[PDB]
RNA sequence: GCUUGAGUCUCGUAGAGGGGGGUAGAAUUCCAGGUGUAGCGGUGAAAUGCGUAGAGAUCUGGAGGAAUACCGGUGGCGAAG
């Protein structure tokens, strides 16, 4: 439809979900999946096989896309952090560059108290 | 009376010692807008809760508060805190 010919997929994992979405390079979302959407409800969702069945169900489709190389950017601590990767290259798209991101504060905004179980 | 206790004077050193003022980066939250669409979030497992009145994710701009990520250590300073 827009036939890009490139992007980049931001990959949002944690420990109890994993998000993809493809987008541009001046962000502008395409397309999007999560491991909790593609029927992995429960505790498997937080698993590293469902984040990879998330990034090739996302990536899919690639005729109407037309993103041939598409970079990645990860977030967060995810389930190995490098299946969504394995499954994505070989999804179509040759992978050059992987940034993490990884939001570090730098001290305030005291984190939330400890749990005592 | 004396100089060894105590003290003053000259030249330097290290240090989160204390009070006042200024400024910088990261991140959380919130507000406006763009793409986008069915989930998000959380747990041992759930539910409440948020979302088709368009959430979450993602990009641009803005507001405001608080603390200073490594350096950082069987390191330092302070009578103690
Ligand atoms: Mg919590
Ligand atoms: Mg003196």
Request: charged share 20%.
């Amino acid at each position: 439809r827009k036939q890009v010919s490139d992007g980049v997929a931001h990959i949002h994992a944690s420990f109890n979900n994993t998000i993809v979405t493809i987008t541009d390079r001046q962000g502008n979302a395409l397309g999007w999946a999560t491991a909790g959407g593609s029927g992995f409800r429960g505790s498997r969702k937080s698993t590293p096989f469902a984040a990879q069945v998330a990034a090739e169900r996302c990536a899919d489709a690639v005729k109407e896309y037309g993103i041939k190389n598409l970079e990645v950017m990860v977030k967060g601590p995810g389930p190995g952090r490098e299946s969504t990767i394995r499954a994505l290259n070989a999804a179509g798209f040759r992978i050059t560059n992987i940034t993490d991101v990884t939001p570090i504060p730098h001290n305030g905004c005291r984190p939330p108290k400890k749990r005592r179980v």
